[PDB]
């Protein structure tokens, strides 16, 4: 069940992409400082949901 | 031995656990390694408890619809269980689970069951607050 | 390197301290009168602060706690 | 042919969807409904004034009508009178009620002389053996659970005992 | 080549051993093994009085829970003509038409859990919860045991009972159509149940069947008309039937009948001579002296109840129909208080006679659907 | 009743199933019995790569 | 097949099982073995069970002329359920005495 | 002058175990009792209310009571409904064919004695413990739908009353006796054909 859900969302939906494109989450602020753990936990977040 | 803090000295106490029992069995587990051996009773049903802990009391068996007087004259459960107990045994750990011509097992009857510890290590049972507590029932008795 | 401990310590402790004892209150406060997507709110958080949510899950200890000397 | 199939393959799927999505959005208000079912075991149901639980025994209300056997479904208890010479009615010595062999008939409750056979309602029968069920005179009272007399109970009335709507 | 479908019997109605051949996936011949629940009432029924025998009926009868006491009171009261008032008769009619519901639920719910309706299992129990309070507050513990004495009934049902139908009394009415819109929805519901275990009317009457399962072939052999049972027929009603007789026809005929239950109940509560019980309660205090109240009408008991009554030779039969099926208690009219011979005629024993002839050249799933739709229970069968 | 909620209930069922005295029926044995669920579990475990 | 009266402490097995496992649950049903109370309701010393083993021939050879039906199995179990009752009513055998529920099918002890 | 005295405790029951090796099995049995699963069985006059234990009147599934319809899997079976002579020779097979941590109980006063089937009839069995060793006997015909949960709570403590050495009292021996027959065989009677 889990692998099927994960595969259908990683295929037909944005895997760890937000509702706004994944690269766009960095450009609109002109600078990043500590986006590492933020993006890690947010990839576990926006995907598992 | 947190139970040992209030059993060997007092020999009279009541268990006030949450009403599920899922936290009290660990306590009973520890008291098999001193000389204490289990006797669960569920006190509800018997008459004057003296003749249930000292005397040969006729326990009328569940009748079969017929057969006027037929009572097998059952024995008590203290001296015989001592006879089966080894000479290496500290006390008879007993649980009055239902402490909450019959005789109401009132607090006077518990005082009279608090003397056999002194003159069986009995503990009354009654559910209470979520935290497993214990309290000397003799002061609650009367 | 000296004053680095307070920042990474306070946020990492808050990451596992306040949410565990309050998720059980937000779920016990409403369980049968919720909305169509309300159960989605605290359930997801059930993972995020998980560093401490399991530390206040039924794992909550009832040791005998040797008293003050 | 196929043109009929090329026309009906969308019809089958549209019927499937019109049923599936309809049932889905209908049970939507069920998966996140606002009913509250039975609570924990500390929230027992309300009991109105006609039921049967643990019958009661007496020594000043069973005048020795002795109908004890002529009521229970298997003539359950004993009958015992033992050569009295007060007037003509021999005494009440031997008796044992045993709910393990009484099936809650106890119909003498309706035909007993002075309110002797009655009703109660508890059930903590921690039976570790069948032969421990000798229910004599007074400890049957025991002042039972008394649902309203407990300090951890707030029982709301059920459907047929609460108000309308 | 042959395996048993399990005495553990992963089905609704208890324990049924089904030994059946198996060609990989399809079956060729199945056989039932019955007799595992012998209540042996035919023996005790001679060595007993009436009142000590009264609670015995709702023991092998806990699904119907009331269709056993009708005939069990016909023999003591309806035979020797201990005149039952029409008001107490209407009370018994309320009882019987609520037991119709007590059967409709305890079939359809489990029938929903057999056909494929996975969720509504707990739903129908939540609906039924109110009948529990009713049966409890009326006469007995949970199954309302001992609601039929000999000279009438136990005691007139309390005041918070009769006039207080209204809650479920209009709740279930709007609730019925839920099942009717759900069954026609998701034809996977319907596809598996349609066109299985079909039976005709000529064989339905040739095999001795009864109940809505038979009425579903345009037979309309509904025995709620043919008997002046307690002079009930003052009320109006609507015959429920279908014209196929198969499993889907069974569902239709057993969903179209419960709508008449609350109809008869509404007829009664306002048509009972006493009406509601609080009405008769507040009326017997202004005319305590003498009136139609407490007379041949408005009386729960006619004469004294007691285990002492003699009988003459009178061996009468009644084919009292329950929504599961017919029932009869024939008995040699004997001169002694308790009679010589007892006999019962349950629907379950007159239903499975076609069972091995129903599942023919079908599969295990087809057998499951037919056995879930046939509306069969043990308890009644063995006696 | 498994604590506040069933957060410990799942691993409780796991630990209960852990002991449960595996029976190993007579007809058919370790030759294929223990070999059965191993393929099942590996087929989905290796997919996590 | 193996249709035996497997009542508590009375299991007259109509099939050969006296291995750790019968390997077919019947071993073609050619021996009619029996095992005595696996629940340890009674503790057994050989001498006490020797009378039961001796009277087994009295029950299988002295009074058997009917085919392999459970009728004979009840014919055996009836006296089997009372030989133990006699052996206990004269105090030669006693109950489980272990850490089980310690149930009393014949009730608690008496004072004769 | 006691009749049928109880055997003597052979062991002195004198030992002491380490906490790091005892709390393991302690919590193990805690889980074993707090994760029990029912086994489906129900026949007659003391069964029907079991179904209501799954709904909005009584809900024992709130404690993780997963109803399993298979002997080899589950561990808790309720002998609900009055049992007769038959359906018993296959009932005990269930108890024989499940893992050892069963701790079975009873349900229905007509199963501890056979209450309303105890005047004269050659079908009903007098109690269940004369067929299977169980722990708790439940009254009521019908059994009180709340008393069953209370008795489950009662039995919930016996498992918690177990230690690491207690995991040896389920090992068996074999009083397998070597005695033959001399009689005539009977062909199968339950011929499955119509």
Automatic annotation (TrEMBL), chain C:
Recorded superkingdom? Eukaryota
Compartments where found = Membrane
Kindly list the residue ranges recorded as spanning the membrane: 4-27, 39-59
Identification of the protein by name: Predicted protein
Q: What gene name is listed for this protein?
A: LOC123395574
TrEMBL record, chain D:
- The reply to whether Chloroplast figures as a keyword in the UniProt entry is yes
Topology relative to the lipid bilayer, per the entry, is: Peripheral membrane protein
Q: Keyword annotations for this protein?
A: 4Fe-4S, Chloroplast, Iron, Iron-sulfur, Membrane, Metal-binding, NAD, NADP, Plastid, Plastoquinone, Quinone, Repeat, Thylakoid, Translocase
User: What compartments host this protein?
Assistant: Plastid, Chloroplast thylakoid membrane
Q: Tell me, what is an example of a GO biological process annotation in this record?
A: photosynthesis, light reaction
Q: Name one GO cellular component term.
A: chloroplast thylakoid membrane
Annotated binding of [4Fe-4S] cluster 1, by residue: 62, 65, 68, 112
Q: Which InterPro entries match?
A: 4Fe4S_Fe-S-bd, 4Fe4S_Fe_S_CS, NADH_quinone_OxRdtase_chainI, NDHI
Q: Which residues form the 4Fe-4S ferredoxin-type domain?
A: 53-82, 93-122
**Keyword Magnesium in record:** no
Reactions accelerated catalytically: a plastoquinone + NADPH + (n+1) H(+)(in) = a plastoquinol + NADP(+) + n H(+)(out); a plastoquinone + NADH + (n+1) H(+)(in) = a plastoquinol + NAD(+) + n H(+)(out)
The kind of enzyme this is, by top-level EC class, is translocase
Q: Which residues cross the membrane?
A: none
Give the GO molecular function terms: 4 iron, 4 sulfur cluster binding; iron ion binding; NADH dehydrogenase (ubiquinone) activity; oxidoreductase activity, acting on NAD(P)H, quinone or similar compound as acceptor; quinone binding
Quick one: which residues bind [4Fe-4S] cluster 2? 72, 102, 105, 108
Complex and partners: NDH is composed of at least 16 different subunits, 5 of which are encoded in the nucleus.
Q: What does this protein do?
A: NDH shuttles electrons from NAD(P)H:plastoquinone, via FMN and iron-sulfur (Fe-S) centers, to quinones in the photosynthetic chain and possibly in a chloroplast respiratory chain. The immediate electron acceptor for the enzyme in this species is believed to be plastoquinone. Couples the redox reaction to proton translocation, and thus conserves the redox energy in a proton gradient.
Record gene name: ndhI
From TrEMBL, chain E:
Stretches assigned to the NADH-quinone oxidoreductase subunit D domain: 114-383
- Which reactions is this enzyme annotated as catalysing? a plastoquinone + NADPH + (n+1) H(+)(in) = a plastoquinol + NADP(+) + n H(+)(out); a plastoquinone + NADH + (n+1) H(+)(in) = a plastoquinol + NAD(+) + n H(+)(out)
Task: State what this protein does.
Answer: NDH shuttles electrons from NAD(P)H:plastoquinone, via FMN and iron-sulfur (Fe-S) centers, to quinones in the photosynthetic chain and possibly in a chloroplast respiratory chain. The immediate electron acceptor for the enzyme in this species is believed to be plastoquinone. Couples the redox reaction to proton translocation, and thus conserves the redox energy in a proton gradient.
- According to its UniProt record, where is this protein mainly located? plastid
Oligomeric state and interaction partners are given as: NDH is composed of at least 16 different subunits, 5 of which are encoded in the nucleus.
Species of origin reads: Hordeum vulgare subsp. spontaneum (Wild barley)
- The molecule here is called NAD(P)H-quinone oxidoreductase subunit H, chloroplastic
Which GO terms of the cellular component aspect does the record hold? chloroplast thylakoid membrane
Q: Which family does it belong to?
A: Belongs to the complex I 49 kDa subunit family.
Intracellular or extracellular location(s): Plastid, Chloroplast thylakoid membrane
Q: Which PROSITE patterns match?
A: COMPLEX1_49K
User: What gene is behind this protein?
Assistant: ndhH
Alphabetized, the UniProt keywords read: Chloroplast, Membrane, NAD, NADP, Plastid, Plastoquinone, Quinone, Thylakoid, Translocase, Transport
Q: Its membrane topology, per UniProt?
A: Peripheral membrane protein
Q: What is its EC number?
A: 7.1.1.-
Gene Ontology molecular function: any one: oxidoreductase activity, acting on NAD(P)H, quinone or similar compound as acceptor
Instruction: Tell whether Membrane is among the UniProt keywords.
Output: yes
A GO term (biological process) for this protein?
photosynthesis, light reaction
TrEMBL record, chain G:
**GO MF terms on file?**
oxidoreductase activity, acting on NAD(P)H, quinone or similar compound as acceptor; quinone binding
Q: Give the reactions, separated by semicolons, that this protein catalyses.
A: a plastoquinone + NADH + (n+1) H(+)(in) = a plastoquinol + NAD(+) + n H(+)(out); a plastoquinone + NADPH + (n+1) H(+)(in) = a plastoquinol + NADP(+) + n H(+)(out)
Q: Say yes or no: keyword Transcription regulation present.
A: no
Protein keywords: Membrane, NAD, NADP, Plastoquinone, Quinone, Translocase
Domain of life, per lineage:
Eukaryota
Q: Where in the cell is it found?
A: Plastid, Chloroplast thylakoid membrane
According to its record, what are the GO cellular component terms? chloroplast thylakoid membrane
Keyword match NADP? yes
- The primary location reported for this protein is plastid
Q: How does it sit in the membrane?
A: Peripheral membrane protein
Please describe the quaternary structure of this protein. Part of the chloroplast NDH complex, composed of a mixture of chloroplast and nucleus encoded subunits. Component of the NDH subcomplex A, at least composed of ndhH, ndhI, ndhJ, ndhK, ndhL, ndhM, ndhN and ndhO.
Q: Which family does it belong to?
A: Belongs to the NDH complex subunit M family.
User: What role does this protein play?
Assistant: NDH shuttles electrons from NAD(P)H:plastoquinone, via FMN and iron-sulfur (Fe-S) centers, to quinones in the photosynthetic chain and possibly in a chloroplast respiratory chain. The immediate electron acceptor for the enzyme in this species is believed to be plastoquinone. Couples the redox reaction to proton translocation, and thus conserves the redox energy in a proton gradient.
The name this protein carries in UniProt is: NAD(P)H-quinone oxidoreductase subunit M, chloroplastic
Q: Which organism is it from?
A: Hordeum vulgare subsp. vulgare
Full-length numbering of the shown residues? 92 to 203 of 213
């Amino acid at each position: 069940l889990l692998v099927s859900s994960l595969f259908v969302t990683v295929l037909y939906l944005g895997g760890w992409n937000f509702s706004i494109p994944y690269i766009s989450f960095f450009d609109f602020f002109q600078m990043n400082k500590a986006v590492g753990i933020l993006e890690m936990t947010m990839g576990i977040f926006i995907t598992l949901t | 031995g947190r139970w040992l803090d209030d059993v060997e000295k007092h020999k009279a106490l009541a268990i006030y656990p949450p009403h599920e029992g899922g936290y009290e069995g660990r306590y009973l587990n520890r008291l098999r390694y001193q000389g204490y051996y289990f006797l669960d009773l569920s006190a509800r049903g018997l008459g004057d408890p003296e003749s249930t802990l000292t005397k040969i009391h006729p326990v009328c068996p569940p009748s079969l619809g017929r057969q006027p007087v037929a009572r097998w004259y059952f024995p008590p459960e203290v001296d015989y269980r001592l006879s089966l107990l080894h000479p290496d045994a500290k006390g008879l750990i007993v649980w009055v689970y239902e402490a909450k011509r019959l005789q109401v097992l009132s607090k006077a009857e518990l005082q009279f069951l608090a003397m056999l510890p002194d003159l069986v290590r009995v503990i009354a049972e009654c559910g209470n607050w979520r935290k497993f507590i214990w309290k000397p029932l003799k002061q609650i008795s009367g | 390197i000296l004053g680095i401990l307070p920042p990474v310590a306070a946020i990492a402790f808050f990451y596992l301290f306040v949410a565990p004892p309050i998720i059980m209150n937000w779920m016990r406060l409403r369980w049968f009168k919720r909305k169509f997507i309300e159960t989605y709110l605290q359930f997801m958080f059930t993972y995020l602060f998980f560093p401490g949510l399991m530390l206040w899950a039924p794992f909550v200890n009832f040791r005998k706690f040797p008293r003050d000397k | 042919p196929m043109v009929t199939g090329f026309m009906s393959y969308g019809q089958q799927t549209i019927r499937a969807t019109r049923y599936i999505g309809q049932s889905f959005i209908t049970t939507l208000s069920h998966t996140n409904r606002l009913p509250i079912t039975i609570h924990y075991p500390y929230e027992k149901s309300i009991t109105p004034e006609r039921f049967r639980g643990r019958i009661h025994f007496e020594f000043d209300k069973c005048i020795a009508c002795e109908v004890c056997v002529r009521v229970c479904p298997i003539d359950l208890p004993v009958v015992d009178w033992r050569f009295e010479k007060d007037i003509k009615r021999k005494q009440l010595l031997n008796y044992s009620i045993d709910f393990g062999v009484c099936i809650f008939c106890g119909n003498c409750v309706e035909y007993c002389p002075t309110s002797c056979l009655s009703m109660t309602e508890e059930y903590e029968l921690s039976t570790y053996d069948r032969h421990e069920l000798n229910y004599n005179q007074i400890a049957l009272s025991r002042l039972p659970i008394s649902i309203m007399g407990d300090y951890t109970i707030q029982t709301i009335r059920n459907s047929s005992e609460s108000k309308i709507n | 080549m042959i395996v048993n479908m399990g005495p553990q019997h992963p089905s609704m109605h208890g324990v049924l051993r089904l030994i059946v051949t198996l060609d990989g996936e399809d079956v060729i011949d199945c056989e039932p093994i019955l007799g595992y629940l012998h209540r042996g009432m035919e023996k005790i029924a001679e060595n007993r009085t009436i009142i000590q025998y009264l609670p015995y009926v709702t023991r092998w009868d806990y699904l119907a829970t009331m269709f056993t006491e009708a005939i069990t009171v016909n023999a003591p009261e309806f035979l020797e003509n201990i005149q039952i008032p029409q008001r107490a008769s209407y009370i018994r009619v309320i009882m019987l038409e609520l037991s119709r519901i007590a059967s409709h639920l305890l079939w359809l719910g489990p029938f929903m859990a057999d056909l494929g309706a996975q969720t509504p299992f707990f739903y129908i129990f939540r609906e039924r919860e109110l009948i529990y309070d009713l049966f409890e507050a009326a006469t007995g513990m949970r199954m309302m045991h001992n609601y039929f004495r000999i000279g009438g009934v136990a005691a007139d049902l309390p005041y918070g009972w009769i006039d207080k139908c209204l809650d479920f009394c209009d709740y279930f009415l709007r609730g019925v159509v839920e099942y009717q819109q759900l069954i026609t929805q998701n034809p996977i519901f319907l596809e598996r149940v349609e066109g299985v275990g079909f039976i005709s009317g000529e064989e339905a009457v040739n095999w001795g069947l009864s109940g809505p399962m038979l009425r579903a072939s345009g037979i309309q052999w509904d025995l709620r008309k043919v008997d002046p049972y307690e002079s009930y027929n003052q009320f109006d009603w609507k015959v429920q039937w279908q014209k196929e007789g198969d499993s889907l026809a069974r569902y239709l005929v057993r969903v179209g009948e419960m709508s008449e239950s609350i109809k008869i109940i509404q007829q009664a509560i306002e048509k009972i001579p006493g009406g509601p019980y609080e009405n008769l309660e507040v009326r017997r205090f202004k005319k305590e002296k003498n009136s139609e109240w407490n007379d041949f009408e408005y009386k729960f008991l006619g004469k004294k109840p007691s285990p002492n009554f003699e009988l003459s030779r009178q061996e009468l039969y009644v084919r009292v129909e329950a929504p599961k099926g017919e029932l009869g208690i024939y008995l040699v009219g004997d001169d002694s208080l308790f009679p010589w011979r007892w006999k019962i005629r349950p629907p379950g024993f007159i239903n499975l006679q076609i069972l091995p002839q129903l599942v023919k050249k079908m599969k295990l799933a087809d057998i499951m659907t037919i056995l879930g739709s046939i509306d069969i229970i043990m308890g009644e069968v063995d006696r | 009743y498994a604590g506040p909620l069933g957060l410990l209930q799942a691993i409780a069922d796991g630990t209960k199933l852990l002991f449960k005295e595996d029976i190993l029926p007579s007809r058919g044995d370790i030759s294929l019995f223990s070999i059965g669920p191993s393929i099942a579990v590996i087929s989905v475990l290796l997919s996590f790569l | 097949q193996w249709l035996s009266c497997t009542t508590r402490h009375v299991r007259i097995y109509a099939a050969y099982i006296d291995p750790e496992t019968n390997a077919f649950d019947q071993t073609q049903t050619d021996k009619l073995t029996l095992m005595l109370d696996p629940t340890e309701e009674f503790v057994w010393t050989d001498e006490t069970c020797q009378m039961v083993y001796n009277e087994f021939q009295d029950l299988v050879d002295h009074y058997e002329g009917a085919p392999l039906s459970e009728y004979t199995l009840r014919l055996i179990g009836s006296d089997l359920e009372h030989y133990i009752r006699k052996l206990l009513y004269d105090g030669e055998i006693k109950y489980n005495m272990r850490s089980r529920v310690l149930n009393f099918s014949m009730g608690k002890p008496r004072v004769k | 002058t006691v009749m049928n005295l109880i055997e003597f405790p052979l062991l002195d029951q004198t030992s002491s175990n380490s906490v790091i090796s005892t709390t393991l099995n302690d919590l193990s049995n805690w889980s074993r009792l707090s994760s029990l699963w029912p086994l489906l069985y129900g026949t007659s006059c003391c069964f029907i209310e079991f179904a209501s234990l799954i709904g909005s009147r009584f809900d024992f599934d709130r404690y993780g009571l997963v109803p399993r319809s298979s002997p080899r899997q589950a561990d808790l079976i309720l002998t609900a409904g009055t049992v007769t002579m038959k359906m018993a020779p296959s009932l005990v097979r269930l108890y024989e064919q499940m893992p050892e941590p069963k701790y079975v109980i009873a349900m229905g006063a007509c199963t501890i004695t056979g209450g309303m089937f105890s005047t004269d009839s050659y079908s009903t069995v007098r109690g269940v413990d004369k067929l299977i060793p169980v722990d708790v006997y439940l009254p009521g015909c019908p059994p009180k739908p709340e008393a069953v949960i209370d008795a489950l709570t009662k039995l919930r403590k016996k498992i918690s009353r177990e230690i690491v050495e207690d995991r040896t009292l389920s090992q068996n021996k074999k009083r397998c006796f070597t005695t033959s027959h001399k009689l005539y065989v009977r062909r199968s009677t339950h011929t499955g054909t119509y």
